[PDB]
Amino acid sequence: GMAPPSVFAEVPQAQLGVGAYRTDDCQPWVLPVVRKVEQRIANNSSLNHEYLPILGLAEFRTCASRLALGDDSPALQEKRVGGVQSLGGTGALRIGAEFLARWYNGTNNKDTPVYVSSPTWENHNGVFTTAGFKDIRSYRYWDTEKRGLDLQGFLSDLENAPEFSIFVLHACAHNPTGTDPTPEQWKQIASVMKRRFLFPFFDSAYQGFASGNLEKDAWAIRYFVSEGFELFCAQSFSKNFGLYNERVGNLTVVAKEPDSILRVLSQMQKIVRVTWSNPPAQGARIVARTLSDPELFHEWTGNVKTMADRILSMRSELRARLEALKTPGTWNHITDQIGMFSFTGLNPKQVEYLINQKHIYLLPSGRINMCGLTTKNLDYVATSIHEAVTK
Amino acid sequence: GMAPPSVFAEVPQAQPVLVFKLIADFREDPDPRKVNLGVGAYRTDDCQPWVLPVVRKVEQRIANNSSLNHEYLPILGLAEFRTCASRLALGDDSPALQEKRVGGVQSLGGTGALRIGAEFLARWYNGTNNKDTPVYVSSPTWENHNGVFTTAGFKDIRSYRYWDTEKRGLDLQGFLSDLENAPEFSIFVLHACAHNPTGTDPTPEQWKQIASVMKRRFLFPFFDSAYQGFASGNLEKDAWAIRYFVSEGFELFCAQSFSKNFGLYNERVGNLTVVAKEPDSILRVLSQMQKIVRVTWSNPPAQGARIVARTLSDPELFHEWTGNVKTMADRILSMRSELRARLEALKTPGTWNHITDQIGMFSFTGLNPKQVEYLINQKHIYLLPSGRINMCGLTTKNLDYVATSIHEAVTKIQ
């Protein structure tokens, strides 16, 4: 019998692996300072739920930017810094990408190349593609054979990039390889970028998380600022505050003069208004309170160090069991790598042994999260790995 | 010597939105009689923001559960929230829920639900990447409808007749004519109830006429539902038009906001409800929704959704919330009734029953822009040049002043 066809009839179906921090117990961890501030918030009868400003909670935006840039930053003294509270680091990247696609290098120029690292966090392509960018390029970064950063490959890709190209840079704790340039390598990178007018779009999702120290982990950003770059920095508080599901992020903008900031933020407002309208309050409030209070801030830093040290511990104990197991290959990359994630150096095959032969679950890329290791399994994975590297 | 120019040197300063200018001025006003009818959120009789008692109760509960963690929610949101929200709009006994052809996507308020649904439509509706499909919005409408559909890529945004300045009412004939003349598969953004900004809604009988032309011409209903319960005090009646379309066999989208009816403005709690002809299409549609969310906000925040989900799934808290909701609706009905009564006592020229025929916190008063200027400049009564007022700016204490002032504006300025 007759009947109308659905307007969705032809919609097609879209087509150690843990991605967050876990204790040695293998549980999620609400940071102690976060639990403390949540209690304070719940018992402050004087807070309401009225809409935040479109650009977000003022105190959060100021605090977030100062964290990346440092209290003593020249750009903050000179008032040429702005911040846009966003929906996690993803939202910050998306808002920045939408801005650049409309107002950077010409008006509505979707032709500017965008360079991402090879490999990189996968949603990078997705966000910039969705903002309209036609030409997404990757730069050389991971040296599979030396199992480390291909500096010559990266610098060459920088040299051959058209002027005004946008580079997405990981501030620290590169995702997914765990391999970061040293400060001296950063200086060489900055060098080419300044010469060819390349725009730095920093992605900062692990500040503090990666080395245990917030100051250290923000150095590259601050270095670019001190060298007089204009730049965007997408900040996530998902990991270093453990507030994954409250979607707390900040887009920091650094300009050459204070006037530009006002105009840039005015256009930002328009883009936010038609995306989420204004941002949610709960996570931002927790971050702002923590960062504004010297004693909470001090506690927080201790909590972040705790996470960072546990990862360093699985890192030094893993390379060591591996080494001491006289397992074939160099493994100083496992300790030289920084952050939650490590590119093991295994091949897809080896990984097959891992998931199929001894039930170790990790990506085809060879990526593991160090937070899935415990004192209770460290031993076991170490031989399954010495295992695979061998059969 | 020379320092090369900012890459931002040519970015223009955007132009501001009037309402912000209006709020500013209001605060910069020293006259103790000043009145803000331009506010955009609920206010009590002593002009304060109101946190719902059930929300404060649930927040405490949440603070005191140690079992809760902050791990990422699924991309499409908290499952219990998505179900409860969709059931609230459609009703527990909805044929669509029983037949499993309903889907829910947690969103960043009603704005985010509209944005995600617009993005979907611009990629997969009426062909592939078809951005030419006309999108129709009411005349006038909530200022952000245009921007959201424009940014999703739609190029042909049109208006349907709606508000009739002469009748101070619904132009049903013009609406019906614009429906009749719309190209097949055009998308219509419809206000479920409490039309923003006019407060004028079709009656049930009128909705039936609207639905019959959309059915015939395969016009797509994209409902915007920001005031369920808040509107009438009655959750069922306020969902009537949505449910009627479902019962008539329509496929549709429904952008739900919990900002107003839960007073959770700043926790950005929204839901996109999807109703399809077949169960299997919901799976495919949500798979595409996931990809769109992924590159926008990645996954949604937890706090507001946890609050709504707990309230709606617990009989004692649900009953309490319906009482809080009724309180808000009742204050608004009372200001409407009190204002019209005063205008009529003063023998104010013209008809004023639109004041009580309208629904929700917003009202198109019919005042002209010259009468609006008078109220701001001479009376310290702040409202938009359209004549839009928020009924919540009215209180038992300023009512006489406002009625009297409008009466002055109407009689001395023609």
Author numbering:
A (entry chain B): -1 to 13, 35 to 410
B (entry chain A): -1 to 412
Sentences from the paper on this structure:
Here we report the neutron crystal structure of a PLP-dependent enzyme, aspartate aminotransferase (AAT), a fold-type I PLP-dependent enzyme that reversibly converts l-aspartate and α-ketoglutarate to oxaloacetate and l-glutamate via a ping−pong bi−bi mechanism. Pyridoxal 5′-phosphate (PLP), the biologically active cofactor derived from pyridoxine, is one of the most ubiquitous cofactors found in nature, catalyzing ~140 different types of biochemical transformations. Recombinant porcine cytosolic AAT fortuitously packs as a biological and crystallographic homodimer, with the two active sites having different activities toward the substrate analog α-methylaspartic acid. In AAT, the protonated pyridine nitrogen of the PLP (N1-PLP) enhances charge delocalization through resonance, permitting the subsequent transamination reaction.
To probe the structural changes that occur upon internal aldimine SB protonation, we obtained a low-pH X-ray structure of AAT in the absence of substrate, in which both chains are in the internal aldimine state. At pH 4.0, the internal aldimine shows geometric differences near the SB of PLP compared to the neutron structure at pH 7.5. When the geometries of the internal aldimines (chain B) from the pH 7.5 and pH 4.0 structures were compared, two major differences were evident. The torsion angle between the SB C = N bond and the pyridinium ring, and the O…O distance between the Y225 hydroxyl and O3′ of PLP are different. In the pH 4.0 structure, the SB is 22° above the pyridinium ring plane, compared to 46° in the internal aldimine at pH 7.5. Additionally, in the pH 4.0 structure the O…O distance between the Y225 hydroxyl and O3′ of PLP is 2.9 Å, compared with 2.6 Å in the internal aldimine state at pH 7.5. In the other monomer of the pH 4.0 structure (chain A, with restricted motion), the corresponding torsion angle and the (Y225)O…O(O3′) distance are 26° and 3.0 Å, respectively. Protonation of the SB nitrogen of the internal aldimine at low pH appears to introduce an H bond between O3′ and the SB by reducing the torsion angle between SB and the pyridinium ring. However, protonation of O3′ cannot be ruled out as H atoms were not observed in the low pH X-ray structure. Forced protonation alters the PLP alignment, suggesting that the microenvironment involving Y225 and the phenolic oxygen (O3′) of PLP influence the SB protonation and reactivity.
